[PDB]
Amino acid sequence: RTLHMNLIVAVDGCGGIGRNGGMPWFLPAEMARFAKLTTLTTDSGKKNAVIMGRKVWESIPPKFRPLKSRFNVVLSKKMKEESNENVVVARSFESAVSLLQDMENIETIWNIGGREVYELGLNSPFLHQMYITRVEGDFLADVFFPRVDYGRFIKSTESEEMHEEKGIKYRYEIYTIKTDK
Ligand SMILES: NC(=O)c1ccc[n+]([C@@H]2O[C@H](COP(=O)([O-])OP(=O)(O)OC[C@H]3O[C@@H](n4cnc5c(N)ncnc54)[C@H](OP(=O)(O)O)[C@@H]3O)[C@@H](O)[C@H]2O)c1
Ligand SMILES: Nc1nc(=O)c2nc(CNc3ccc(C(=O)N[C@@H](CCC(=O)O)C(=O)O)cc3)cnc2[nH]1
Ligand code: NA
Ligand code: NA
Ligand code: NA
């Protein structure tokens, strides 16, 4: 019935997310939380889906492709079809979402992005929550998170401490779309 689409992203002080096709940092504890948030489901036997762009797919080491215990959906007009049954190449955002709402064993769609994928999620009726990791500093990024109006959301007020790995500081933020709260 209810099918949420959540956004999860780590942005720096200028909203940057990507550099030279990869991520501008490596935060193992932050990424373990990413893996847990995008994998764990309320209903066991049900799965979560991750929707991503081709460049996010190419940024994952092939030994970790596809992302374990999740149904992978890759948006691309150029990619050949993936024979792996846990991966589907979707030619459009609308067809990807329609396919995911068709499969009943999917509990939550996690938009793991690429700027355009995040942008389409921000305009989706299924938009539910944004899980933003705000990293301190300017990491000289060449790809940025979409310009989002935070006034559309309610910021969750749970206590959020500062984190640090490898001399990199960051804090967690959670937002809920205002029509859902
Ligand atoms: N820090 C973070 O939390 C975070 C989050 C995600 C990614 N990143 C960084 O962001 C960068 C990549 O993100 P990106 O935005 O540059 O590229 P991307 O969006 O990850 O992938 C772009 C590709 O996705 C496909 N695509 C996107 N929208 C589509 C649509 N509506 N219909 C069909 N195909 C579509 C196209 O593939 P074709 O070109 O094959 O058509 C496009 O070239 C990387 O550097 C990555 O490390 C970081
Ligand atoms: N909060 C957040 N952090 C990120 O690093 C992030 N990265 C992307 C895109 N880039 C990547 C890069 C690597 C992996 C990856 O290898 N994930 C594995 C390993 C997690 C772990 O280290 O335990 C996974 O199982 O989730 C995923 C996304 C999208 N949203 C994000 N969101
Ligand atoms: Na497939
Ligand atoms: Na679309
Ligand atoms: Na802009």
Author numbering: 3 to 183
Report text from the authors:
We report the structure of WbDHFR complexed with NADPH and folate using X-ray diffraction data measured to 2.47 Å resolution. The finalized crystal structure revealed a typical DHFR fold with four alpha helices and six parallel strands and one anti-parallel beta strand, similar to the human and bacterial orthologs of DHFR. The crystal structure reveals a ternary complex with both NADPH and folate present in the active site. NADPH was intentionally co-crystallized with WbDHFR while folate was used for the methotrexate-agarose column elution and remained protein-bound throughout the purification process. Interactions observed for folate and residues of WbDHFR include hydrogen bonds between the carboxylic acid of Glu-32 in WbDHFR and the N3 and NA2 atoms of folate (see atom labels in Fig A in S1 Text). Phe-36 is involved in π-stacking and makes van der Waals contacts with the para-benzoic acid group (PABA) of folate. NADPH binds in the extended conformation identified in many DHFR structures. The backbone NH of Val-58 forms a hydrogen bond with NADPH while the valine sidechain contacts folate via van der Waals interactions. The nicotinamide ring of NADPH is involved in π-stacking interactions with the pteridine of folate. In SmDHFR, the Met20 loop is disordered while in WbDHFR, it exhibits a typical “closed” conformation; these loop conformations are discussed in the article by Sawaya and Kraut.
